[PDB]
Amino acid sequence: RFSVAEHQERYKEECQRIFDLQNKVLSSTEVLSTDATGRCLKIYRTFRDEEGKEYVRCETVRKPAVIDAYVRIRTTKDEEFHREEMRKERRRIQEQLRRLKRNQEKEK
Amino acid sequence: APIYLHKMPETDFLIIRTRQGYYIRELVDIFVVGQQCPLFEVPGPNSKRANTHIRDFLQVFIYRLFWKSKDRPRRIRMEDIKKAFPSHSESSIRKRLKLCADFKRTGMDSNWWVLKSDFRLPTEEEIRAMVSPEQCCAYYSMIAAEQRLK
Amino acid sequence: KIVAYELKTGGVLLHPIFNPASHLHFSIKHPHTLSWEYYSMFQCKAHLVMRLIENRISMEFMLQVFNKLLSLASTASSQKFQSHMWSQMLVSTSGFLKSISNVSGKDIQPLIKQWVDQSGVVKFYGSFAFNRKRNVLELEIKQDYTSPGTQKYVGPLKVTVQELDGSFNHTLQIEENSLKHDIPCHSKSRRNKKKKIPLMNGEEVDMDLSAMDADSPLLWIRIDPDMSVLRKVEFEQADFMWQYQLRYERDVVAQQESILALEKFPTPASRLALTDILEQEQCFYRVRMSACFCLAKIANSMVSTWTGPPAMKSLFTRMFCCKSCPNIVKTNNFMSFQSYFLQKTMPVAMALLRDVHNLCPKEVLTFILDLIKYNDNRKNKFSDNYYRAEMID
Amino acid sequence: PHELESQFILRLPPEYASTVRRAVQSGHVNLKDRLTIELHPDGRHGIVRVDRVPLASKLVDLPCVMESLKTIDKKTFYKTADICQMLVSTEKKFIWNHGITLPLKNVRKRRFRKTAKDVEKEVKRLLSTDAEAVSTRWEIIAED
DNA sequence: CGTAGGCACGTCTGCTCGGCTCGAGTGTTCGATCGCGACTGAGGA
């Protein structure tokens, strides 16, 4: 039931074997011959055309890679509930400054 | 890392292109580099060594911008540092400039970060002793692997 | 030697520019107007500054500089042209710095500007305090830069702290306005279990940790251990830290400075430390020769407390006398060359013992006279003139 | 300022490679007139003209990373550039599977570990279309 | 007609709060020997 020399020697020999296989393969000048849900994603899009129209586009994504990246943003944006917020902050700063100026007028 | 000398293919040359033109060398020696045995530890993301390297790299860049300044009170601009490090929040850049510099709003040197008169700007060997190039390579390996995993 | 001379009178100025040194009563423009003590200290400071240049730019690059100078000179030495090329055998400062910059790519112009062109040494006064809450070591290093021989150091400074987890080096940046340097400290888990404490080299030893503080892990601190500046350090450790630094350090200059600092602490633990140094072969012999005189001074300071015989007498009879006769010395065999030096230096320090009446005891004088009478040198292959001369001393 | 030099490898047909090699090792500026390189605004297509004879070229991506290393004493080597592209003369087509050396052949297919979960750009375009829209309806689907 | 006293941004200042890393410190588990009594063949009364 070795817990000491057996493990150490086994690791050492596997190390020498891999080192020696890599050296040989790499220095070879031999020529080498040239050789979960199963569910797709479909999106419906509603847009307005020039003049007056309301066409709807149904687009199906069968690439599971595109799927993963697409959904992950929605799930994030669904939990994410901004230029508008920055504008609101600017309005807040303006109001605060006006209030401070009113305070200065009251003091003087 | 173990390297293995191979002769070049008989068809391949090396073209060095610059803005002015193309230049051609032949090559005769090409090594194949095996699996590397790392001697430097790449830090992890958000590690203490990682944040220390980011802070020290920003400080070294700020010192070298102060050395390059020709004004007799050495002065730099903030948006040079914001062009170099655009992912940095400006609170961290102002933290690095808080000691060793001060902001002049009015008069001469206005909208510049002049160097403090009591502050001795470090010499070239001290700035070299701050950050090592191998630490920069370890940081670049960390952020490239961060991108690939992400 | 150089810090004593430069604090005594002005300073030695390597490479003056033509007066450049007006603090001293002769002119340094010519070698034949220099004082002889200034000439001796000039050569001494020159070789220490070259050791500093080796510290900044490594020893193999230094030997490459010297080989490049010699090779230019020996290609010059074979030409016949009357000095078109014979002046490559003459070195200058600018040529030496240019050859250094050629072989290394680093220039040493701050080090040259500080230790060559400026003529001063630095004085360091250090004191520490251990913050138990944040586990840090707050050093306090202040310089005396207003003395006549001194100058102000603004570079980096190495400090070596021996804690229970081992020996750690730290680099401190000592700018003009700097006073407190907070360095971090490690665990104290080698006091939880008895494990060996690892030293500056790869080895580890058993230490008696009964004298150490319970709250601090750090065993000793050394400011600038490698002598990388031209400095005089005055560090304020605790006496047990000086005793640990005397016993378990693997550096002879730290053992010597702990011997030098143990003269202010005449406690019996310091007597035990110096006596354990004296008994210990595999200590460097010039440390034991200093511990003799330190033990004599400590013994003179703790009269009306000293228990047994006079200092080093029982140790002399244990090391150098017969097993059957304690007062008869062994016949002289000087073939070891370290117990010869220790044997000829131990009565010289033992004679500095004094009683409560300020007179040398008649137990040490009788011991020295019996060392003189029973001296037999018909058996060693070496002469006895220095040992007998030290007996007269 | 300094701009990092951009080195790539040029692979020629073997007879044309022999003529270009002889003209390079000769060293006259006669080679300069003989060998020209025209890179098309596709970015992955070109002509290499050897002795005024046009050859069709493709700039391909190499599977490994090469690095040019210069030396003065043949004991210490300084890295000068990274090479990752080759202008072979005679997208998926612009990716080369083999490496330059003989042991590295079919490296991308066999000696490269592949970890998997263009696509990101397509997802960004889809998000932009959703933004320009009014109502979006989504369902993970089954076979249909 | 001119001419000095009030509104928007930009960048920095400073304080507060929450989160993340990291190592010291402390308690918990598990193989590694140490010792005791016993098992079991073995050469002389």
PDB file of C-alpha atoms in Angstrom, chain A residues 2-100:
ATOM      1  CA  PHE A   2       2.870   2.396  -0.822  1.00  0.00           C
ATOM      2  CA  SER A   3       2.001   6.091  -0.346  1.00  0.00           C
ATOM      3  CA  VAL A   4       5.640   7.349  -0.788  1.00  0.00           C
ATOM      4  CA  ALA A   5       8.283   5.764  -3.100  1.00  0.00           C
ATOM      5  CA  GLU A   6       5.644   4.211  -5.398  1.00  0.00           C
ATOM      6  CA  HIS A   7       3.942   7.548  -6.245  1.00  0.00           C
ATOM      7  CA  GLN A   8       7.220   9.434  -6.478  1.00  0.00           C
ATOM      8  CA  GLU A   9       8.920   6.849  -8.799  1.00  0.00           C
ATOM      9  CA  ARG A  10       5.811   6.486 -10.949  1.00  0.00           C
ATOM     10  CA  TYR A  11       5.689  10.261 -11.483  1.00  0.00           C
ATOM     11  CA  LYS A  12       9.437  10.329 -12.225  1.00  0.00           C
ATOM     12  CA  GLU A  13       9.291   7.567 -14.837  1.00  0.00           C
ATOM     13  CA  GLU A  14       6.261   9.071 -16.562  1.00  0.00           C
ATOM     14  CA  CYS A  15       8.230  12.346 -16.682  1.00  0.00           C
ATOM     15  CA  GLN A  16      11.264  10.679 -18.328  1.00  0.00           C
ATOM     16  CA  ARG A  17       9.074   8.849 -20.777  1.00  0.00           C
ATOM     17  CA  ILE A  18       7.228  12.032 -21.896  1.00  0.00           C
ATOM     18  CA  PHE A  19      10.447  14.042 -22.085  1.00  0.00           C
ATOM     19  CA  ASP A  20      12.007  11.333 -24.336  1.00  0.00           C
ATOM     20  CA  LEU A  21       8.891  10.992 -26.583  1.00  0.00           C
ATOM     21  CA  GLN A  22       8.764  14.778 -27.126  1.00  0.00           C
ATOM     22  CA  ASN A  23      12.469  14.983 -27.931  1.00  0.00           C
ATOM     23  CA  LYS A  24      12.170  12.275 -30.547  1.00  0.00           C
ATOM     24  CA  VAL A  25       9.005  13.533 -32.239  1.00  0.00           C
ATOM     25  CA  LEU A  26      10.238  17.118 -32.395  1.00  0.00           C
ATOM     26  CA  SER A  27      13.720  16.352 -33.752  1.00  0.00           C
ATOM     27  CA  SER A  28      12.243  13.974 -36.419  1.00  0.00           C
ATOM     28  CA  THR A  29      13.265  15.065 -39.961  1.00  0.00           C
ATOM     29  CA  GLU A  30      10.836  12.399 -41.294  1.00  0.00           C
ATOM     30  CA  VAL A  31       8.297  13.893 -43.774  1.00  0.00           C
ATOM     31  CA  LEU A  32       4.690  13.733 -42.430  1.00  0.00           C
ATOM     32  CA  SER A  33       1.890  13.146 -45.003  1.00  0.00           C
ATOM     33  CA  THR A  34      -0.764  15.908 -45.294  1.00  0.00           C
ATOM     34  CA  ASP A  35      -4.009  14.495 -43.794  1.00  0.00           C
ATOM     35  CA  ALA A  36     -27.162  19.823 -24.337  1.00  0.00           C
ATOM     36  CA  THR A  37     -30.844  20.548 -24.989  1.00  0.00           C
ATOM     37  CA  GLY A  38     -30.559  20.065 -28.781  1.00  0.00           C
ATOM     38  CA  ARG A  39     -32.511  23.348 -29.111  1.00  0.00           C
ATOM     39  CA  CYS A  40     -32.030  26.084 -31.791  1.00  0.00           C
ATOM     40  CA  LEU A  41     -32.891  29.807 -31.225  1.00  0.00           C
ATOM     41  CA  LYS A  42     -35.555  31.707 -33.275  1.00  0.00           C
ATOM     42  CA  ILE A  43     -36.100  35.525 -33.020  1.00  0.00           C
ATOM     43  CA  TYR A  44     -39.140  37.530 -34.285  1.00  0.00           C
ATOM     44  CA  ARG A  45     -38.383  41.216 -35.116  1.00  0.00           C
ATOM     45  CA  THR A  46     -41.018  43.972 -35.701  1.00  0.00           C
ATOM     46  CA  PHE A  47     -39.923  47.084 -37.695  1.00  0.00           C
ATOM     47  CA  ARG A  48     -41.541  50.023 -39.581  1.00  0.00           C
ATOM     48  CA  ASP A  49     -40.728  50.445 -43.332  1.00  0.00           C
ATOM     49  CA  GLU A  50     -40.528  53.848 -45.174  1.00  0.00           C
ATOM     50  CA  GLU A  51     -43.948  55.560 -45.652  1.00  0.00           C
ATOM     51  CA  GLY A  52     -46.247  53.277 -43.594  1.00  0.00           C
ATOM     52  CA  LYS A  53     -45.652  49.516 -43.035  1.00  0.00           C
ATOM     53  CA  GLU A  54     -45.262  47.040 -40.099  1.00  0.00           C
ATOM     54  CA  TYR A  55     -43.334  43.987 -41.450  1.00  0.00           C
ATOM     55  CA  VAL A  56     -42.231  41.250 -38.960  1.00  0.00           C
ATOM     56  CA  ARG A  57     -39.006  39.204 -39.523  1.00  0.00           C
ATOM     57  CA  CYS A  58     -38.660  35.683 -38.005  1.00  0.00           C
ATOM     58  CA  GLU A  59     -34.946  34.675 -37.975  1.00  0.00           C
ATOM     59  CA  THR A  60     -33.718  31.235 -36.773  1.00  0.00           C
ATOM     60  CA  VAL A  61     -30.154  30.821 -35.353  1.00  0.00           C
ATOM     61  CA  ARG A  62     -28.942  27.172 -35.668  1.00  0.00           C
ATOM     62  CA  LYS A  63     -25.389  28.038 -34.489  1.00  0.00           C
ATOM     63  CA  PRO A  64     -25.188  26.983 -30.803  1.00  0.00           C
ATOM     64  CA  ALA A  65     -22.237  29.355 -30.367  1.00  0.00           C
ATOM     65  CA  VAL A  66     -24.260  32.385 -31.505  1.00  0.00           C
ATOM     66  CA  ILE A  67     -27.069  31.119 -29.267  1.00  0.00           C
ATOM     67  CA  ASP A  68     -24.983  31.096 -26.068  1.00  0.00           C
ATOM     68  CA  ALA A  69     -23.595  34.608 -26.553  1.00  0.00           C
ATOM     69  CA  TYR A  70     -26.973  36.014 -27.589  1.00  0.00           C
ATOM     70  CA  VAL A  71     -28.984  34.612 -24.658  1.00  0.00           C
ATOM     71  CA  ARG A  72     -26.275  35.516 -22.081  1.00  0.00           C
ATOM     72  CA  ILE A  73     -26.732  39.236 -22.895  1.00  0.00           C
ATOM     73  CA  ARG A  74     -30.559  39.099 -22.552  1.00  0.00           C
ATOM     74  CA  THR A  75     -30.301  37.197 -19.220  1.00  0.00           C
ATOM     75  CA  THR A  76     -27.805  39.877 -18.163  1.00  0.00           C
ATOM     76  CA  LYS A  77     -29.906  42.761 -19.503  1.00  0.00           C
ATOM     77  CA  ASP A  78     -32.925  41.136 -17.836  1.00  0.00           C
ATOM     78  CA  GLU A  79     -31.042  41.406 -14.530  1.00  0.00           C
ATOM     79  CA  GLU A  80     -29.508  44.747 -15.521  1.00  0.00           C
ATOM     80  CA  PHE A  81     -32.823  46.446 -14.738  1.00  0.00           C
ATOM     81  CA  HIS A  82     -26.658  54.809 -19.426  1.00  0.00           C
ATOM     82  CA  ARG A  83     -26.549  58.073 -21.454  1.00  0.00           C
ATOM     83  CA  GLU A  84     -30.044  58.929 -20.109  1.00  0.00           C
ATOM     84  CA  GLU A  85     -28.816  58.273 -16.529  1.00  0.00           C
ATOM     85  CA  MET A  86     -25.753  60.526 -17.159  1.00  0.00           C
ATOM     86  CA  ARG A  87     -28.105  63.287 -18.396  1.00  0.00           C
ATOM     87  CA  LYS A  88     -30.224  62.781 -15.229  1.00  0.00           C
ATOM     88  CA  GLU A  89     -27.049  63.110 -13.095  1.00  0.00           C
ATOM     89  CA  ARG A  90     -26.175  66.353 -14.962  1.00  0.00           C
ATOM     90  CA  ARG A  91     -29.691  67.697 -14.238  1.00  0.00           C
ATOM     91  CA  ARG A  92     -29.244  66.717 -10.553  1.00  0.00           C
ATOM     92  CA  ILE A  93     -25.886  68.569 -10.410  1.00  0.00           C
ATOM     93  CA  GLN A  94     -27.476  71.677 -12.001  1.00  0.00           C
ATOM     94  CA  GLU A  95     -30.309  71.616  -9.439  1.00  0.00           C
ATOM     95  CA  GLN A  96     -27.844  71.162  -6.546  1.00  0.00           C
ATOM     96  CA  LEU A  97     -25.673  74.081  -7.802  1.00  0.00           C
ATOM     97  CA  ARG A  98     -28.750  76.340  -8.125  1.00  0.00           C
ATOM     98  CA  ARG A  99     -29.771  75.389  -4.562  1.00  0.00           C
ATOM     99  CA  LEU A 100     -26.200  76.206  -3.350  1.00  0.00           C
TER     100      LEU A 100
END
